[PDB]
């Protein structure tokens, strides 16, 4: 089935987050994990895999054992938004971001044109690019937000110019979306936020459309 689009007061409001939006911003700045054609070299818990990506140990956490079992010792590409603070390990941590390398490579990059709406109105479109036939939503989300942070100040040091935001992925009939804003209160926990990626959700890079819906204050 397709995910119902956000309800009236379902989306997090940035004005109700009173901590430093910097802690969200830094997740969608230049720093990120990207590795091509690598295989796991260790494992901590039964739902993670450790990769060597100088080389750092990257702990990739999945939602369950089935996903870790699937990719253990398979040659993959890894792409995602990593964190350090309270990274539990025994170095950096991330969730998901894993795609089989073999059979998934494109000769030429595919472009996906993000459509950006502000209060319902399309003011901006821009392309993200990938070499992958099947690509994680995480990778596409990161690339989309990276552009919006640089160019639209999506996240600033203290807060955002936007009250709400969600990113919507559409593949033919089916769609799903992520809330782009922090939960309310004075703390932002990066590990909790990023866990949304632990399902390793994948989309087809030819068919997927990306729509971002922002509201202003």
């Amino acid at each position, epitope marked *: 089935e397709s995910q119902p689009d956000p309800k009236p007061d379902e989306l997090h409001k940035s004005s109700k987050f009173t901590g430093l939006m910097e802690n969200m911003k830094v997740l969608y700045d230049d720093n990120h994990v990207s590795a091509i054609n690598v295989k796991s070299i260790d494992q901590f818990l039964y739902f993670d895999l450790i990769y060597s990506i100088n080389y750092d140990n990257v702990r990739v956490e999945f939602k369950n054992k089935d996903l870790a079992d699937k990719y253990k010792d398979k040659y993959v590409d890894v792409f995602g938004a990593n964190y350090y603070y309270q990274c539990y390990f025994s170095k950096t941590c991330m969730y998901g971001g894993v795609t089989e390398h073999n059979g998934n490579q494109l000769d030429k990059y595919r472009s996906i044109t993000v459509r950006v709406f502000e209060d319902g109105k399309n003011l901006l479109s821009f392309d993200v690019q990938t070499n992958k036939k099947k690509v994680t939503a995480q990778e596409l989300d990161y690339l989309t937000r990276h552009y919006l942070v640089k160019n639209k100040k999506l996240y600033e*040091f203290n807060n955002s110019p936007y009250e709400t935001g969600y990113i919507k992925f559409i593949e033919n009939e089916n769609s799903f979306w992520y809330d782009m804003m922090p939960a309310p209160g004075d703390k932002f926990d990066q590990s909790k936020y990023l866990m949304m990626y632990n399902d390793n959700k994948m989309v087809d890079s030819k068919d997927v459309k990306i729509e971002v819906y922002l509201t202003t204050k």
Partner: nanobody
Amino acid sequence: QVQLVESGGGLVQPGGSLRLSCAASGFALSLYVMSWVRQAPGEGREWVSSINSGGSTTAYADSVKGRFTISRDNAKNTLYLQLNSLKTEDTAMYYCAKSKYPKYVPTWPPLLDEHDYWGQGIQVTVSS
């Protein structure tokens, strides 16, 4: 291995200007808030200034605000401090300090104890 090496600084008359430079190696500067702290004779460490990883946000101690400017160049892995309108009270060893927390900012401005590496330091003297 993590290294911070301060250079520049020096001796100047009151009202003058100096510049400090810190070359970072063994880590990516871009992951870290960076700070300048100083230690004047017979004093404890004093926080002077901080800059976030991006470069968009700077903070200064009251005593130096409007006179000093912190900046960074992540590509060159360097932190800078411009010291203008110097006063005798500014005489001190100056140290470049790295946040203990990659990709995370618990407090702004940062606390002195939220740094975990320092260089050997560079002398600034405003000669009386």
